[PDB]
């Protein structure tokens, strides 16, 4: 025979709790490379970014390595 | 090829009754020029500098 019903409360705030919010982890994840990727791309004209992040990347780096020939070049 | 050719026609004939005052040496450079060639033409001429120290 059993008396009362067998439960705990999780905690929880603002209607979010950690089973959920677990199952979300991975999702944030994934959003957080869309966000990365793209705000990479939108920049991926600067000279900063080629300089700094992008001719460092192995193989494909050489794509961002182009040199004005000084003959061409007024400045 | 055509353009710097037209260039010489320019300098040689046209120059003498027209001019060509929106186009700097530096426009000149990696289109119909090198870089040398066009600071040669541009340093053969004298351009107005800033007055001296008694103005
Ligand atoms: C680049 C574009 C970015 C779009 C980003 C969208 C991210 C939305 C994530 C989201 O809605 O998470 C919901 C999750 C909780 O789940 P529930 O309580 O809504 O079922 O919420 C939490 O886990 C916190």
């Given at each position: 025979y059993v008396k009362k019903p067998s439960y705990k409360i999780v905690p929880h705030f603002l209607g979010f709790n950690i089973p959920t919010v677990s199952k979300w982890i991975p999702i944030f994840g994934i959003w957080g490379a869309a966000a990365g990727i793209g705000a990479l791309f939108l920049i991926e004209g600067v000279p900063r970014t080629r300089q700094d992040?992008?001719?460092?990347?192995?193989?494909?780096?050489?794509?961002?390595?182009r040199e004005i020939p000084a003959s061409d070049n007024p400045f | 090829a055509s353009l710097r050719r037209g260039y010489q026609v320019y300098k040689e004939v046209c120059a003498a009754c027209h001019?060509?005052?929106?186009?700097?040496?530096?426009?000149?450079?990696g289109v119909t020029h090198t870089t040398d060639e066009a600071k040669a033409f541009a340093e053969e001429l004298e351009y107005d500098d800033e007055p001296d120290d008694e103005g």
């Open positions: 992040i992008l001719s460092k990347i192995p193989i494909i780096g050489e794509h961002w390595i | 001019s060509l005052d929106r186009i700097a040496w530096r426009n000149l450079v």
